[PDB]
Every structure is written in C-alpha cells, then in structure tokens.
Amino acid sequence: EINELKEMVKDEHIYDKLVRSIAPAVFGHEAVKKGILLQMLGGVHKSTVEGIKLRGDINICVVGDPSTSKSQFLKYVVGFAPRSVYTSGKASAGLTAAVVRDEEGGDYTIEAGALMLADNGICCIDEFDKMDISDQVAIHEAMEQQTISIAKAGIHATLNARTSILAAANPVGGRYNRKLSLRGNLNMTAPIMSRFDLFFVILDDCNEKIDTELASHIVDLHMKRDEAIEPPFSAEQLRRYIKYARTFKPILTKEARSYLVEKYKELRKDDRITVRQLESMIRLSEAIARANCVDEITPSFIAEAYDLLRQS
Amino acid sequence: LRIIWGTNVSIQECTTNFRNFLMSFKYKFRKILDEELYYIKQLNEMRELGTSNLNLDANLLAYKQTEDLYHQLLNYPQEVISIMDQTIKDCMVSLIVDNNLDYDLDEIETKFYKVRPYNVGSCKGMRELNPNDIDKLINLKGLVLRSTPVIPDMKVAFFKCNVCDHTMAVEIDRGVIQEPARCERIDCNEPNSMSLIHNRCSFADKQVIKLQETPDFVPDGQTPHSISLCVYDELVDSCRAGDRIEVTGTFRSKTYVDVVHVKKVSITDQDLAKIREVAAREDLYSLLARSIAPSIYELEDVKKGILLQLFGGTNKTFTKGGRYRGDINILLCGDPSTSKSQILQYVHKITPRGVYTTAYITRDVDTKQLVLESGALVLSDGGVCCIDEFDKMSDSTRSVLHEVMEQQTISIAKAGIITTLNARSSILASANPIGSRYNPNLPVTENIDLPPPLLSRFDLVYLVLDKVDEKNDRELAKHLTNLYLEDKPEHISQDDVLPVEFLTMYISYAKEHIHPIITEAAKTELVRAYVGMRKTRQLESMIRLAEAHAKMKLKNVVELEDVQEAVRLIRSAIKKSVIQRKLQEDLSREIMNVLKDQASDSMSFNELIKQINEHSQDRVESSDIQEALSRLQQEDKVIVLGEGVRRSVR
Amino acid sequence: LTRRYFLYFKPLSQNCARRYISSKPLSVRQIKGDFLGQLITVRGIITRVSDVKPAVEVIAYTCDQCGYEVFQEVNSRTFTPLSECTSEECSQNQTKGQLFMSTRASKFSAFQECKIQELSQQVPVGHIPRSLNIHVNGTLVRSLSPGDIVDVTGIFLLEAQFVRQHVEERVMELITSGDVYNRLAKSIAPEIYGNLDVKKALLLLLVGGVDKRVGDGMKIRGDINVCLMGDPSQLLKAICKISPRGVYTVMKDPVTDEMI
Secondary structure, rough: HHHHHHHHHOOOOOHHOOOOOEEEEEEEHHHHHHHOOOOOOOOOOOOOOOOOOOOOOEEEEEEEOOOOHHHHHHHHHHOOOOOOOEEOOOOOOOOEEEEEEEEOOOEEEEEHHHHHOOOOOEEEEHHHHHOHHHHHHHHHHHHHHHHHHHEOOOOEEEOOOOEEEEEOOOOOOOOOOOOOHHHHOOOHHHHHHOOOOOEEEEEOOOOOHHHHHHHHHHHHHHHOOOOOOOOOOOOOOOOOOOOOOHHHOOOOOOOHHHHHHHHHHHHHOOOOOOHHHHHHHHHHHHHHHHHOOOOOOOHHHHHHHHHHHHHO | OOOOOOOOOOOOHHHHHHHHHHHHOOHHHHHHHOOOOOOOHHHHHHHHOOOOOOEEOOOOOOOOOHHHHHHHHHHHHHHHHHHHHHHHHHHHHHHHHHHOOOOOOHOOOOOEEEEEEEOOOOOOOOOOOOOOOOOOOEEEEEEEEEEEEOEEEEEEEEEEEEEOOOOEEEEOOOEOOOOOOOOOOOOOOOOOEEEEEEEEOOOEEEEEEEEEEEEOOOOOOOOOOOEEEOOOOOOOOOOOOOOOOEEEEEOOOOOOOEEEEOOOOOOOHHHHHHHHHOOOOOOOHHHHHHOOOOOOOOOOOHHHHHHHHHOOOOOEOOOOEEEOOOOEEEEEOOOOOOOHHHHHHHHOOOEEEEEOOOOEEEEOOOOOOOEEOHHHHHHHHHOOEEEEEOOOOOOOOHHHHHHHHOEEEEEEEOOEEEEEOOOOOOOEEOOOOOOOOOOOOOOOOHHHOOOOOOHHHHOEEEOOOOOOOOOHHHHHHHHOOOOOOOOOOOOOOOOOOOOHHHHHHHHHHHHHOOOOOOOOOOOOHHHHHHHHHHOOHHHHHHHHHHHHHHHHOOOOOOOOHEEEEEEEEHHHHHHHHOHHHHHHHHHHHHHHHHHHHHOOOOHHHHHHHHHHHOOOOOOOOHHHHHHHHHHHOOOOEEEEEOOEEEEEEO | OOOOOOOHHHHHHHHHHHHOOOOOOOOHHHHHHHHEEEEEEEEEEEEOOOEEEEEEEEEEOOOOOOOEEEEEEOOOOOOOOOOOOOOOOOOOOOOOOOEEEEEEEEEEEEEEEEEEOOOOOOOOOOOOOOEEEEOOOHHHHHOOOOOOOOEEEEEEEOOEEEEEEOOHHHHHHOOOOHHHHHHHHHHHHHHOOOOOHHHHHHHHHOOOOOOOOOOOOOOOOOOOOOOOOOOOHHHHHHHHHHOOOOOOOOOOEOOOOOOO
C-alpha cells in the first residue's frame, strides 16, 4: 500500500488522471470534475488567532439545463464516498437535524438527518430550488458558522457538524438564458446564495463533433461492463490517496499572498464578490496542494485555481 | 401396517418409495408432463461446502411411483418433513457406506438436514384460504413492507444452583420449559432453589414480517391484504422490504403462514412452435398493434408504443455500482373524448402490478424499526403505473416523479428517516392541453402547460389530437355501430387478430428469454438521428426503443432497419407540392438519362435501385420513383412489361 | 363433530304468502327490541365488511397417556385452555398427565362480520341511517362484496342464513292508456310549468340505459349526465324524491387496521 502510494506521489501527471478519473462515466466537464475532486478534501480551517473556528470547507453547486449528466456525479459520490448522504431535496428541520421525543423523561433527541449524518464528507442535495424556506434558512443557519443549533422544550444545544454541500439546482424555466445574471435565474435569496465556493453552469447546443462522440460513448456504455469507461487507475489506491492527502495539513507563503491580493482585486474588478469567495479560493488552494501532495504551496498551482475561478 | 390417527401416511412404505424416487430420477417431467442422475449429483455436490439445506421441487408429481406422496404432503407437511429429515440422513449414510471415504461420519451422525418444498401451484391469496386448508402448504406472491427485528426465542436454557454451581440444560417441547425445583447431584444433595440463566443458552430466532399480497387473479371488489408471516432460524435477515417475493409455507390459525421457503429470485412445445411460426411473418409488427385492442381504432404509434412499452427492453447492470433498465415513460396529450381512459384501464387489466392514481418510510415505534408503507408506484416496482390528469396534479408531488423519470429511486429526507431506495416501473400518463384542447396558433411546449426540464426527460410523448374531417370519422362511427349491427360479437374470430391468452404467453416468453445486445453496426444511423433533433435523454430513450424493437420478432442482435422505424415513431408522435413536382421532374430527367445512356436497355427495377443510389448518400422515396415511372407510363416513355425487365419506348 | 354438511334456511316469499307475514322487509329502526329471535329479512347497503377468518367451534385435546381425545365446545368470543384432564381414565387415577391441542381435528368455520346500514329513503325525517352488525359463518362468507344493496334473512341474537341482491296489473294499466312516453313525461313533477323536453331527457336520464362490456378488459359507460344551465331546485328535488338513493348535494382504520 505504501509501495503504491510512494510510487503515486513521485510522478508528475497524477492530477491530470485525477481530474478524468474522479468521474469516468461522464464525457466532458473537466471543471465540474475539478471542483468535485477538490470538494472531497478541505483545509486550513483549524483555529483563528482569536479562538473561533472558521468555515474551512468547499461548497459546490451545479446548475444548467434539463437532461444532462450532472446527476450522474450525484450518483457516483454516494456510490464511492463512504461519508456521503444523498437526499432528493424536493421531498425534504430534517435537513438541519430534526428533533424527536423520548417518553422516559419526555425528553428530546436530535436526529442528524441529511445535515449532520456525514463527518468530513459530502452531503448531496438534488433539486435544491424546490425546497421550502424553513430548510433553506436552516441550511443557512448551519452554514454561517460550522455548527447546528436545536432549540426545543426549553433546551438549546449546538454542535459541530462538518459538511460539504453538493447542491444540484435548476432554473425557473429550465433553459439557461445568457440574457441576465445568476441571481434572477437561480431564484433564491442572496444569503442562501452566499457561502458557496464554486458554481458550475452547463449549457448545451448542437455541436456535432463532440455530440457524436458523446452519443457513441452512451451507446458503447450500454453493454456488459465495457472497457471504454475504464479510468487510468482504479479507486483501490485512490481511497488511501484521499486519506493520505487528508492527513497532510499544508500552509501558504508570502508570494502566494502577494499574488492572492492581486487575484482578489482581479476577481472584484469583474463586478456579488466579497470575503466569502476569497475564503473559498483560499480553501481550494490547500485542497489542490493536498491533491498534488506539495507542502509549501507555490503560486503556480494557485494560478490554476485562479483560472478555475475565471472559467466560472 | 402403521397408521397414525387422522393421517393416511405409513412410515416404512413412504420411506421406501422416497428412497426409490431419490435413487432413480432422470428428467421424467421433460418426457410426460442428455443428463443422468439428477438428484445424486446435487446431493453429492452439497455435502462438501457445508450447506445442510436441500431445495426440493414437488418432479414428485410427474414421477410414476410417487403420485401417492405428493397427495400426502399437501395435507400433512409437519409429519412428512419430520420423517424426511430421518430418511435423507439414512440415504446419505447409505451413500457414505458405498464408497471409500475419510472421517466424515464424525459430524454427520449428529447433524440435521431439512427439506424446503416450493414447486407447488398458485392460489388466490388469503381469500381462498378457507378453514379446510389449515395446516396445508400454501404460496403467496407479493411484496414485503415491514421487517421486525429478529427476536431471540430460547430453544434451550441453563439452570444453575446458586449455592453449589452445577449446571442443567433444558430444551423446548411444544412451547413449555420444565423448571427443575431442587438440586439432584451428589455434591449438592440439599433441597434449594435453582436459577435460570439465558445469556448462555442458544435461542431460535423468530421474526414477524408484514407482506402485501397480490395474486395473478383478483376478484371484483377485493382490496389488497397485509398478511403477518413469521420466519424462524437460518432464514432471518434474508427477506426484507423492497422486493417482489414468492413465499411458501404452512398456513396456520388470527391466522398466519409458517414459511418453509422463500424465493428472492425469479408453455408447451406445440405452443412454442406456433410462437415461432407466427414470429416469422412480416406483418407481426402491425398484427400485434391490431390485436392489442380490436374494440378501438388504429393508433399505430400509440398502440405500437404501449406494445413495446409492455415488451420492456433490456435491463443490464454492473457488478457493484451501476444499473440501467430498458424503460420508457410515456405521456399522452391532445384532443379529448377518445380512447385514452380505455387504454388507461386496458393496461391495468393486462399487467399484474399497477395502481390507477409514491410510498413512504415510517419509523414504527412498536418494533423500533424503519418499515415502509405504500401503494401506487411503490407497489408496481414491476410492470406499469397509470396516471390520468397530469396537468391538474400539484407541483409538490411532481418532485418524486422527477426522480423516477430516469433514476428510478426514492430519496426521503424527513424526521426519523434519510433513505434512498428502489422504485422502478414505468409511467403511463394522460394529460390535457390546459383549457386549449390544443391550439394550432400556439407552440406545443406552451399549449400543455408542462415544464421543459421535466418534459425533455420524458422518453415518449404522444400527440393524440383528432383534427376532425371527412372520410375518417365516418369510418369511426361505422365501426362503432358495426357491433351494434348484431346483438352478439360471435363474428370477431375471422380476422387477423391474435387472442389475449396467446399474446400474453408470447410476451412473457420474449420478456424472459431474450437479452438483445446493441451492436456498433447501428452506430452511423443513430448519430444522424440525434443531430436532426439537435439542429441525451432522447438518445437514452431511442436506444431503449431500438432494443425493444430488437426484443420483438425473436431477435438477439439489433439490426440497422430497426432504428429507422423507431425514429419515424418519435417523429410521428410529435409530428402535390411544387417542390414534389420538381423532385419528380428531375427524377424523371435523371432516370431518362441513366436509362438511355447505356446500350443494354433490358434492366429491371432492383438493379436500377442499386445502380442509381449507391454512388451517393441515403435512400430517396421509391414510391415517388414508382409514381414517376407511372407518369412515364401515361406519357408512353417507358414500358413496364412485367416485374423482371424495365424497357423504354422505341 | 361428524357434520359433513352445513345447515341453512331461507324464508317464503310474498307470492307464497298471498297464496295461503313471516318474511317482511324490515328496517333497523323497525327492530323495536322484542324481535330478538325472529327470522328477519333486512334490506340495506353494505359499507363495512371484514376478512374471512377461521373461528373455532370445538377444541380438540389429545393425550399420550390414555389416548382418549377429548372435545370441548366454545360459545363465546373467548375461552380458557382446559389444562386439567377430564377423561374417563384419569378420574380413577393418581396421575393427571399433560394434554395437547390439535388444530387439525378441531372444527373451524369461516367467520365474517359485516355492518348493514339503513336505506336512504326508508329513514325518517331528520334522522340518520344507523347501522347494525351481522355475523356470518360458512359458505355464505363470499356472498357479501361491499358497495351493494342486499336482503339478508337470518336470526337475530345477526346470524345470517340466506342473502340475495337486486304488480302486472299496475304495469299493464299504465301501458294500455296510450302514449306511454308523453304520459310518463308529463306525469313527473307537475307543479312546474311546461319544459317537457328538459324533463323528457330527465326521464331518459333516470331510466339510465345499457351498460356495454366488450369482454376483453374494457368497459364503457351506459349512463347519461345532464346539465341545466339557466338564469334566475324543485325539478332536482322531484327527481331525487321519485328515484331511489337520490342524494342532494378512503382512509386507514387503526383499531381494526384496515382500509375503510
């Protein structure tokens, strides 16, 4: 196991097979695969110089037109990640850990539900826009501070729940129009729109050269265990690689901070963008440092994250 | 001659005929209802891996010597299972003594073996279970909804004298455990009270399981029933909520069924020859579409779609993380007052599983367990499910059908339960065009008030609009009064129409005997069929449509012509010119040039088709070439002179 | 104990009653209390039915010590197990050995309870249609499917014995007057003025029509539905008062656990 891990950390083309091996059943969409691969492992959350914990996790949300392969990732995470709870979203307090009574003392206990079931994992919510207002403000109360609060029968109890929301949303009309902004098309309020590190917009049209390849891949997949789907390496070493990169704990330098202030100015020159998107790209930097297994981070690997933010 | 009171079963005679059937049986049911020693090989195979269970097929019916055994075990299973446990051990030790072996007798002398009979005929559920059928074998087909946690029952029990510590093991006998009063050993002779210990006693596992029953035939007015069955040891945690389960056991009396076997997995030669002879015809593709509903009209696309919808397709899966089902979810829209509800009822009268409308998990507090409690789609995790008035349905319940469109899953995230589960059948929904009943001045995507995301994911839509005119509705009224011409339709048999009983047998044979593969040879015609709608849900729908085309007509390999009609299907399901006159004009000019350029004018039509259409791309309409040659026949340019030679004028 | 058959009764009709009383169509409001033990023929709709269940009549006990199998007879809803031996050999003995039960030699019966309800036009002014309980046994257990009108003849403890489900001078004197259709049209609701066509179609509406079955799994309607759209209740009330079951305009059950 360590003979496979030391062989896999000494090469140079690991990340390029990792972005095409995190979802081998999906044709195209390297940016969505990049965010899904960097959304499994987080970083630098630890402790603030004062005494309060910060949001060191990566929030990933996918949007686009109907009949795409964006739910396939949703079906992959839950079939591969052990710390992964999937919910239908439309058919959903439960999300933010509901309260149920016990008759001994007529006392309450807090069921995790979708929100607290996973620990250092990915909670994936399909159909995020057909949910109500109560579970979405419970998600917002669970997201401002990495904790969830339950107030019932006179007692108040809050607890540390760490989750990475994988939100699958759709527009109000389904078809994504390039006419306006993301806010009027997503149809949800600003606060619940905030604390999200990366948005993935997928638009489709008639482009025959990649479309014929996609349809051929779909009809070639429809057979008994085809080799077409096959990745460059299996998940057997990828699980221990995820765990080995998880126990690494890397840190930033001065050149990265000097390039980061100019990158935040470049992201704010496009203008909403505030401190939360800066925190999202800071948290994605140590995740890509852990994925490439480099300790002290250089700004050239943060340049790919800058290009990923520019691509969105 | 030993006769038990109230039982017609003799021990030694049934022992000898059971041994005579067990030492000699070579596929007699295949001859009177290649291989050799059908029961010796299985019994000689199972003894090495440690499996004490024996699956027996009640083969006992077709055998010449054991017709008196099958008619004896249906009324008294408790006595015959108890004597079968002794005879199977006796015939196994007779097999041990015939050959040279190692020390295998050290463990089989105390080991016990049982018999699980399951091959019995069907019954009408709990409704036919009258009080003369108590303590008889019975079989139930349905789905289980709730599994109580296994409860330990104490087969044995330990007793300890708390002052002197000598142990006594007691066992069960018809439900009573004698509790010894005082010590009896020689070291503790004194009379003192014993104590029962249980954490050191083996316990038989027991479990009550809720089962929703559904027979092959149901009487009029009958509602579905919930039977409380109870499993025992070595069968606990093998049956749980979510599967179509065939079960069999002993009906007891409140009434219950004591299961002897579970089945988690699932015609004659002359009928098979008739199926093969009727499958070789060309018009079968329309014959079935005419024989599915002879009381209505044509409806070729709609009837062809519901025919291949009940044919199903191909459901293939991976080993651990992948699954795909050949399935199509259909929707109907257009003009009202036609056969829509008829279909919505007819198919409910064809499938053995379906509701005329999702389920829901519940934390049952009595047994502290996550049971499921349902009907509708959940019940039909097989077959079809019929929904009418799709436009009048609410938006809150549309989110569960949004998952069953292509994912066939239920994801509940509520108080007490976060569970995704299996839920695949196929929907058949009838809708209406808002208040419009279809308008020609508005687009199709706005006239039915149906969301685009949820409709692009729909596999098949159907414009069943009337568009009333002459020489159509006249035949409609004539066909509706033609059975009013006579008082009884005894004259329905002299037409090209298959009966219902032959049709369901052919459909049930084709659905369980053909696994067609979609080869790469039909790649080229699929790409271009996709780009015409593009100039992935449609591609996923058309591959299931093409494999259902391959499912019919007894084919194991898909063919190139089979997707042509499939696409015509989805192009017709949503729907003398001057350019046609110009097409006929340039076709006549081109055919006059290629018919007059060569010397040998004696050349037929098939050679003409393969010589003018192979140097370019895809097929032009041959009926237009027939109309152009008939136009030249009228202008005396070409002469037909038979179907073997086409020659021009002199 | 050796009863191979099942005995049942049926009363005489009114045609055999006029031709030289005992079988009158009784309401549940016409029970009075004192009819407990008379054979009664009740007419009504059936709303609540139960599943067929085996109820024991006699309990059979077997012994290995003596061999004399004993049989006790139960009459109530509940009973107690006779663990003490009451045989003819254990009375003259010191030993009083254990007894076991037999579910095969014991005689059972297909018991089913049903709730008969009072008919709609037979109830008085203002009153509600109260129910009554019928306990059936044996071969009559599948003759009661809910959603129908029935005539139940049985003793009143209700132990049913016979069930059934749905004058010439009166029809021939209505026919012989001439113009039967127009006479039956202008006869119903004469307190209003004219409108013979609307109420003529109401006559064709309450006569119903012919239900057609194709015998291949498809049933069409044999009914009419009439709209009355008009500008600024008597015709509607007269139609509901003349026609039977005229009414002026699913859930789980926990106690018994079923679909009511």
